[PDB]
Amino acid sequence: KRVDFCGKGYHLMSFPQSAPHGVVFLHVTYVPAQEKNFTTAPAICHDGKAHFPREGVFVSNGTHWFVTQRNFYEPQIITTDNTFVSGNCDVVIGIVNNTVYDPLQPELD
Amino acid sequence: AGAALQIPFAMQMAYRFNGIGVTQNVLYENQKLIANQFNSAIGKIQDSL
Ligand SMILES: *[C@@H]1O[C@H](CO)[C@@H](O[C@@H]2O[C@H](CO)[C@@H](O)[C@H](O)[C@H]2NC(C)=O)[C@H](O)[C@H]1NC(C)=O
Ligand SMILES: *[C@@H]1O[C@H](CO)[C@@H](O[C@@H]2O[C@H](CO)[C@@H](O)[C@H](O)[C@H]2NC(C)=O)[C@H](O)[C@H]1NC(C)=O
Ligand SMILES: *[C@@H]1O[C@H](CO)[C@@H](O[C@@H]2O[C@H](CO)[C@@H](O)[C@H](O)[C@H]2NC(C)=O)[C@H](O)[C@H]1NC(C)=O
Ligand SMILES: *[C@@H]1O[C@H](CO)[C@@H](O[C@@H]2O[C@H](CO)[C@@H](O)[C@H](O)[C@H]2NC(C)=O)[C@H](O)[C@H]1NC(C)=O
Ligand SMILES: *[C@@H]1O[C@H](CO)[C@@H](O)[C@H](O)[C@H]1NC(C)=O
Predict the structure, then answer these.
(1) First-to-last CA distance in chain A?
(2) Which residues 74-93 of A have a C-beta within 8 angstroms of B?
(3) How far is CA B9 from CA A4, A42, B16, B23, B31, in A?
(4) For ligand 2, is residue A40 a contact (CB within 6 Å)?
(5) Which of A7, A44, A53, B42 would suit a FRET pair with B25, their CA atoms being 20 to 30 Å apart?
(6) What residue of B is the nearest CA neighbor of A11?
(7) Rounded to the nearest 5 degrees, what angle is found at the Cα of A85, between the Cα atoms of A74 and A96?
(8) What sections of A1-109 are H helices per DSSP?
């Protein structure tokens, strides 16, 4: 996890080869590509409660809000298993209104 | 690690709080105090210099 100790990018793995009086390291790394821009927010307010992502960031495609993982764009809908709650929505700078979906009660019809 | 991708600075500070074991609500609920403390700490360096 040391930055730039094993090449440029996120180190995946490395292979050694012998040279005359030396060694050659072939570093395999992961390099992110083809980014898009989005709107973002730190928390989400629902029922007077602030919701934070467990892992990921809240992003908006223009009209809807999703959670994604931070390094590869893979959007999902914001549920109570995606997030955790802390406090009320009066203290966070930049909080946004949206609905956080519960699975249990629409299972219970 | 590649191309520069923008992110707002308080959200970068929250990632970094996660990287030491503190949840990020602890940053967002203290943002103003944390920024005051950083500013006083930076203002103390030029005084010693
Ligand atoms: C943002 O993504 C959503 C996808 O959830 C698009 O909204 C539509 O949402 C309904 C119900 O959620 C789906 O049945 C549709 O298939 C979605 N797409 C369309 C084209 O109707 C929404 O269009 C996206 N917004 C932008 C600006 O890209
Ligand atoms: C990001 O910065 C913009 C300014 O560029 C902020 O927008 C202003 O919001 C205030 C309310 O606090 C309004 O009174 C101003 O009229 C807005 N200005 C513009 C140019 O839109 C925005 O609130 C900031 N975002 C956050 C999360 O603080
Ligand atoms: C997000 O939703 C909340 C919940 O209603 C909004 O809070 C209201 O804000 C208006 C204007 O600031 C007040 O007149 C109401 O009294 C508030 N309602 C409650 C129940 O407190 C909040 O304004 C919404 N945020 C945005 C940006 O529209
Ligand atoms: C955590 O520590 C900080 C000290 O940096 C406290 O904030 C200070 O509190 C004193 C009260 O004695 C104020 O006079 C200062 O102005 C505060 N500093 C800043 C930068 O706001 C804070 O109260 C402490 N929190 C708790 C829960 O004890
Ligand atoms: C994102 O938008 C900015 C302008 O706000 C633009 O300069 C940048 O090239 C865009 N990047 C992508 C991936 O769309």
Answers:
(1) 47
(2) 86-87, 91-93
(3) 23, 11, 11, 17, 11
(4) no
(5) B42
(6) B1
(7) 65
(8) 104-107
